[PDB]
Every structure is written in structure tokens, then in C-alpha cells.
Amino acid sequence: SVYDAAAQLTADVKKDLRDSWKVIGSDKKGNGVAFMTTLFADNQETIGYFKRLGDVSQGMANDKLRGHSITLMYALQNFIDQLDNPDDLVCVVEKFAVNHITRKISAAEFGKINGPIKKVLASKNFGDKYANAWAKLVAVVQAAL
């Protein structure tokens, strides 16, 4: 249940998401592409889903991948801004879920993004505490898949 999942976003979890997002969200292009390339490096089996992007191994040099990556960061930006209103958070999460449901992405495969996020945050000096806070936000989307 997406509503129960959303209820998991307590005061301290929301604070950690905001604090960390201030840093990660400052460089959407850089951190967005980092999220994606790490995903393709740690989970090669997911690469097939991104056929439209072309050769994802080109990383930042791939215009389609860059455009996709930036936009992805704005989806996360959207979530952060809706944290105060669970009713609004839920409707945007369900909107993005559809984008993935139509691409045949399960909750399990969607969860594979947790690995990249934890790594990127770690390189930014943000540990498990923050990695776990983000896992909860991700869990909200997984509940709609």
C-alpha cells in the first residue's frame, strides 16, 4: 500500500532526505548520470530496458542518457517537494510508477537503484543513515509497482 509506505516517511527520515538532497540535488547532471552509470555497471542485466538511449557506456557523452538523467533528478526533486503533503506525494509517485509499469519494471528491479544511490551518497560522505532514508522513499514507489 503506497499510503502505508508514505506513512513510513517520519519527521527524521524527511529531515535526512532534505539535508542530503541539498547536496546531491545541487548537481543534477553530474549526480544523475552517476546514478545511471553505476546502475549499468553493477546491474548489467538492466541495460536492455534502456534500448532507446543508445550506447549507455558513453556516459556523459550520450545526449539521450544525459537528458534522461537530468529529468530523473527532477522526478526526485518532485518527491522531495511533496513530502509535506502525503496526498500529493502519492499522486506523483503513482504517475511515475505508470511510466515504469508500462516498461515492465517490477518492484524488485526498481529496487536495484538503491545500490547506486548508496554508493553515490557515500562518495559524498553520506553514510548508511542517509542511504536508508532514501531506501524508504524508493520503497514508496515500489509499493505502486
Place this chain on the structure above:
Amino acid sequence: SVYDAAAQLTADVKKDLRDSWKVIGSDKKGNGVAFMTTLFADNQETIGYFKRLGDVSQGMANDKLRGHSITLMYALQNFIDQLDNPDDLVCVVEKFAVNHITRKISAAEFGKINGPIKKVLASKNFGDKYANAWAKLVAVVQAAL
């Protein structure tokens, strides 16, 4: 080319776009929905395109329509943030273009959003000069359709 359409946006147009977005972009849920409802009111022929959203006459109460409207405002947020780097603006513009190209939305039909934007801007006291600025940004997307 889209690059030609983008690389031509001037400092004065970027200035007006940013000043107006400061206000319009501060209430993404309200202004986003206003954009959509005004479109349906003045261009009823477009309603059929949004069947996934269900009964769009429900307005704000329609969770699907609300989720779509908020997200659309972030697409614009994206555009606004990439104004000083045509290279990034182009890759994101082309990304959103595909979303519409897939729905068979022509450059002419996409331009229908100009009316709603003009009216919403006006409700906030941003005149024709500001409406023309936005028409120029919309044209960047049109160059890609």
C-alpha cells in the same frame, strides 16, 4: 534545428522567463492544474488525448490530473534551469519531445498551450511581453516536433 531555436534565446527573454517563473513556479499544483483546465476549457478537442487521466472535469480532485499537472510544472522547472547551457536545454527538450511524438502531438497542437500560459500569466499580472517570452520557449520544443 532545436539548437538554433535555443541558442537564440536572449538575455532579456531569459530574464523575463525567470522573473515570471519565480511567481508562476512557486505554486506548481495550483498553476499547473490551471494550465491544464484552461486548455480543456478553450480547446475541448484536446480532451480525448488525456483519457488516461479519466474525468478531467474533476479538476484538483482528480488525483491523476493533479499528479500530471505537478509533474508538467517540473518539466518547465527543468527547462528554466537549463537556460544558460543550450547544450543541456536541447537534450532535455528532445527528451520531452519524444513523450509527445509518441502520442502523435504535432508542433501546431503543442503550441495550443500558449493560450493557457498567457491567461495564467495575466491572472498574475504578467503581460504580453511575458507571454511572448514563453511563446519563445515553447517554440524551442516545437522545433523538435
